[PDB]
């Protein structure tokens, strides 16, 4: 459709819905371009869906709910987490109208600190999608970078192992290449082995990057404390909260501690909620 910036996300649970409102507020506080948010409807709570028109009127954004049913032929995922990961990567060509030329996935737990139109304008050199690589800058976490040894090191041949927390999809090129049909057919064949695609949303594009190119985004597009150094935080365009296998610190504790403006957005959205309620 007509918005300059089009973002979709997936959220399941009260905690992720609370963070999704914060992510949306952070996008609008950093851009003057028109924005439309797209929601994978079936995982959201009724209260979240009822509150979105109030967020839209307060922050000045458009929105649309997409309800796409998992195709009968396509191998299902019994685990809700894996089903949600399937919705991130398997249906990019069918979730959005043919008129939409580009969409960006932003994780529900992200904090945006840049004008997202800079990602819309980032050149992809013919790639149907662009992902940031996993950071190598936090050196003390090298033992946990599973992609630097074993299966992935041999498979990648020096190519980056990309994180799936943020990605830009040129829907025109994605369509042109039949990337959706190709990703669903590879997923269907690979998923017959239950050990394959452990990190479904991330492993599938990384696996297919020799035939479905990935434009490797600048590292500054995605900063996560687990893999990225403190020194590179000042250059981060977006901040992602991702699992830390070494510390196992809780999600809300990480959010409040890392990002000074997280509490500001959280309190601002709670103030908007009290204003609408009364």
Ligand X SMILES: *[C@@H]1O[C@H](CO)[C@@H](O[C@@H]2O[C@H](CO)[C@@H](O)[C@H](O)[C@H]2NC(C)=O)[C@H](O)[C@H]1NC(C)=O
Q: Which residues bind ligand X (CB under 6 A)?
A: 30-32, 115
Considering only residues 18 through 77, tell me which ones interact with Ca ion, judged by CB under 5 A. Answer: none
Number of residues in contact with Ca ion under rule CB under 5 A: 4
Q: How far apart are CA 94 and CA 126, in angstroms?
A: 21
* Residue 85 annotated as binding site: yes
List Cβ neighbours of 5 (8 Å cut-off, separation of 6 or more): 27, 31, 33, 34, 35, 36, 104, 116, 117, 120
Q: Please, what's the b/e burial string for 215-241 (b: 16 or more CB within 10 A of its CB; e: otherwise)?
A: bbbebebbbbbbbbeeeeeeebbbbbb
* Residue 227 annotated as binding site: no
Q: What backbone torsions phi and psi does residue 244 show, to the nearest 5 degrees?
A: -110, 105
String marking each residue 70-109 x if it binds Ca ion according to CB under 5 A: -------------------------------------x-x
Return the closest-CA partner of residue 102 out of 117, 112, 87: 117
Beta bridge partners of 167: 105, 131
Stretch that binds Ca ion, among 58-66, 128-136, 166-174, 236-244 (CB under 5 A): 236-244
Under the binding rule (CB under 5 A), the answer on residue 225 touching Ca ion is no
**Closest distance between Ca ion and the C-beta of residue 175, in Å?**
27
* Residue 241 annotated as binding site: yes
State which residue has the least CB distance to ligand X. 32
Stretch that binds Ca ion, among 117-125, 138-146, 165-173, 180-188 (CB under 5 A): 165-173
* Residue 16 annotated as binding site: yes
* Residue 266 annotated as binding site: no
Choice between 114 and 196, CB closer to ligand X: 114
Q: What backbone torsions phi and psi does residue 179 show, to the nearest 5 degrees?
A: -55, -35
How many residues in total does the chain contain? Answer: 278
- Cβ atoms of 128 and 101 within 8 Å: the answer is no
Under the binding rule (CB under 5 A), the answer on residue 240 touching Ca ion is yes
**Closest distance between ligand X and the C-beta of residue 234, in Å?**
17
Q: How far apart are CA 233 and CA 44, in angstroms?
A: 31
Q: Which two tokens stand for residue 239?
A: 């901040």
The DSSP code for 135 is P
Q: Residues within the annotated binding site for UDP?
A: 12, 16, 243, 251
Which residues are at the interface with Ca ion (CB under 5 A)? 107, 109, 165, 240
Q: Residues within the annotated binding site for UDP-alpha-D-glucose?
A: 12, 16, 81, 85, 88, 107, 201, 240, 243, 251
């Amino acid at each position: 459709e007509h918005a300059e910036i089009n973002i979709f996300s997936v959220a399941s649970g009260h905690l992720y819905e609370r963070m999704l409102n914060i992510m949306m507020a952070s996008v609008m506080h950093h851009t003057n371009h028109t924005v439309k948010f797209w929601f994978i409807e079936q995982f959201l709570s009724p209260s979240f869906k009822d509150f979105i028109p109030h967020m839209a009127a307060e922050y000045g954004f458009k929105y649309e709910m997409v309800t796409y049913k998992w195709p009968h032929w396509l191998r299902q995922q019994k685990e809700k987490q894996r089903e949600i990961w399937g919705y991130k990567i398997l249906f990019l060509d069918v979730l959005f109208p043919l008129s939409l030329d580009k969409v960006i996935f932003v994780d529900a737990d992200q904090i945006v600190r840049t004008d997202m139109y800079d990602l819309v304008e980032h050149p992809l050199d013919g790639a149907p999608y662009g992902f940031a690589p996993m950071c190598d800058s936090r050196v003390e976490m090298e033992g946990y970078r599973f992609w630097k040894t074993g299966y992935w090191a041999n498979y990648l041949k020096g190519k980056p192992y990309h994180i799936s927390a943020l990605y830009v999809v040129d829907l025109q090129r994605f369509r042109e290449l039949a990337a959706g049909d190709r990703l669903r057919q590879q997923y269907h064949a690979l998923s017959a082995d239950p050990n394959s695609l452990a990190n479904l949303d991330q492993d599938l594009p990384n696996h297919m990057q020799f035939t479905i190119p990935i434009a490797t985004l600048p590292q500054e597009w995605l900063w996560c404390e687990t893999w990225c150094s403190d020194e590179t935080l000042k250059d981060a365009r977006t901040i992602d909260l991702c699992n830390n296998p070494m510390t196992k610190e809780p999600k809300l504790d990480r959010a409040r501690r890392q990002v000074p403006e997280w509490t500001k957005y959280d309190e601002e959205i709670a103030e908007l909620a009290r204003r609408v309620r009364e």
